[PDB]
Point group: D2
Chain length 116, copies 4
Amino acid sequence: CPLMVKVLDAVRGSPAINVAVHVFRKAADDTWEPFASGKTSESGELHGLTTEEEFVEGIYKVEIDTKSYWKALGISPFHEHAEVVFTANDSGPRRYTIAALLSPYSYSTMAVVTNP
Amino acid sequence: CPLMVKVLDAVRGSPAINVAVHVFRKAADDTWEPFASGKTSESGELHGLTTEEEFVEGIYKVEIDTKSYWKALGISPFHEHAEVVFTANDSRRYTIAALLSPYSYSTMAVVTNP
Amino acid sequence: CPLMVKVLDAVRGSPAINVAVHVFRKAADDTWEPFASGKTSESGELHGLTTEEEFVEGIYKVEIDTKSYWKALGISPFHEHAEVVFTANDSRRYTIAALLSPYSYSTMAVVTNP
Amino acid sequence: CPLMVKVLDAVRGSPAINVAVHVFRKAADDTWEPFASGKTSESGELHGLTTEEEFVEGIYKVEIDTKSYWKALGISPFHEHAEVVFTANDSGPRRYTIAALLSPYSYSTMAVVTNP
């Protein structure tokens, strides 16, 4: 898995389930082009977004739709989403795990980058 | 001061000084319109971005230039920048804080009523 | 003010008010000796814990009573308290910040030189 | 695994490997009694600390020896360790994952609690 996203809920002490995630890649004309999307599973993880072949060098944006997540649990949160923007694969293929820990008025995000 | 931004450095345990911050407001065509900008002070804070008159309800984006901060320190970072996107609601002062590490950041909003 | 403690609430986006904070200093027999205490203010801050004369080099523990904070709000929390343990070094002011959620907390130290 | 500890390094974007972890349980006389210990693996995880039978109700303290970790990487960090203190199994057996994200002058800790 070259790109995996994991989301946790710091209010419940649980995976954040059914969180929508949209990935974009910056195009030549500097616009954000849709690249992949999905939703987190019961484990809070989203696998299978892309492949080694498709996940070329570029600048990527992972959008985690946190506001929709919170509202469905009865909470009106601060952020619209959590964005994670990074250059990927510029020194060759890597595996990326993007983690996000969510609270209504805060989030943390961490990346683990490993060489296959 | 309806909007203040504070940035901290978790590698050195210090304010993050001279960090560029850009604020955008979402326009009717869904594009991001430049709204305000500046650089953090020696206290890691950025004051005077906007005014009560000007800071109307809407969706705002605060972009914090973290990559350039780390690059100047000779540290290799993960993110291009940190982004904080939120809706301003009438019914208060917003403090957006960001705690920076090379491969992680934490952001928090403190919303208080005068 | 050589030591200040700030506590924030990530569920409500506010200062964490009236949080009990206890500071201990490690004694020669390795036990924790009560050193200072108080409750956070309406700004979530606790000032005046100690003085320059009294805050000598040594290992200190700051205990933040998070469980009681959440219980009063009717929210079920994970931790008994948050603990911040560190060595004071001569060669500055310490700000210990804690950002609280029911099953998580983040703590940060800002160490600055007058 | 009723109790697992996971540690990540926010400077390197990697698991925190070979981090010593000491677990204590509060005794009847309110002293901290040694309960289990170990070190994180190449994945940043520490498994096998205890068993369902041994991990009874109580107040537990997980000490993560962060200072020793940082010093060996050339960094003089702020904290002596990261402590995580919690009541466990007071409503029956649960599985606990304690995660810690480390920086030299900060850390985050999160617990995921699941019912078998």
